[PDB]
Amino acid sequence: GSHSMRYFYTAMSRPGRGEPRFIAVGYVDDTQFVRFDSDAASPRMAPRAPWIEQEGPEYWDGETRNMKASAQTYRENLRIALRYYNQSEAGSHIIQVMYGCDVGPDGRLLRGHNQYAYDGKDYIALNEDLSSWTAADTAAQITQRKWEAARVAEQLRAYLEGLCVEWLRRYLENGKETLQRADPPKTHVTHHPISDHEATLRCWALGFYPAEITLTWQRDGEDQTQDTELVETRPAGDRTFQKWAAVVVPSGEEQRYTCHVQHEGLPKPLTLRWEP
């Protein structure tokens, strides 16, 4: 199928408590494979998936060098942002960065991404053309002007179309046993009366990978979106994910309701009902 590589950086200032913490994580699809944390005793880019462990010392040394340099740059960026927003040195602030590439089944680039946030709000983003910027406000417009002058977009484009895709393809091959295996959800429906008049039907999906899934309830074949309680998809801790969807139904009407499950690991969408 299609695949993605993403890096996520978080830089968090903490006045009076040392320099800002910098944490980077790297993902292929829904699998984390590297981490870096400036608060570690010995900060290093470190492996978090079995298939990256085979990379040699040049990889780990160069990625560690890059993360250390990035932490210094994002500490500077936090100081710069204070100026651009006329803010005091007393408060804690956060810069976040996401970037990476999406490839199709053929390994061809589908699109790149490179976006930034300040205190949880959009700041600046590289547009899909990988050549122009969208700034959220007049502060980020100052960064935009600086980055236009320095032709930053050209450097990011070269990375996103080149090394990003090439290394994603390498990881997908080295990790094909897991990264290229979809685990379908294990499903069941539970039933719990809530009163003499009503009962809860809960449709469960467990053990699936990747995280993307659709769980829906229908009544007489019509989707029940407004009456369905959906929990966020959640990690089990063994690489897989879990999700459930519940509806409250009139006693005796249970067989009017069907749960529908779509997942990449299923050849055909599933239809489930409560089986008493």
């Binding site: 890096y7 980077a24 790297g26 590297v34 880019m45 990889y59 990625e63 890059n66 993360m67 340099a69 990035s70 740059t73 500077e76 960026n77 710069i80 942002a81 651009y84 970037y99 490179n114 100052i142 960064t143 600086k146 980055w147 320095a150 930053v152 450097q155 990011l156 990375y159 090394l163 990003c164 290394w167």
Partner: peptide, 9 residues
């Protein structure tokens, strides 16, 4: 593989 740093804000 991670991206090199770019210019600051």
């Amino acid at each position: 593989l991670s991206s090199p740093v770019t210019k600051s804000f």
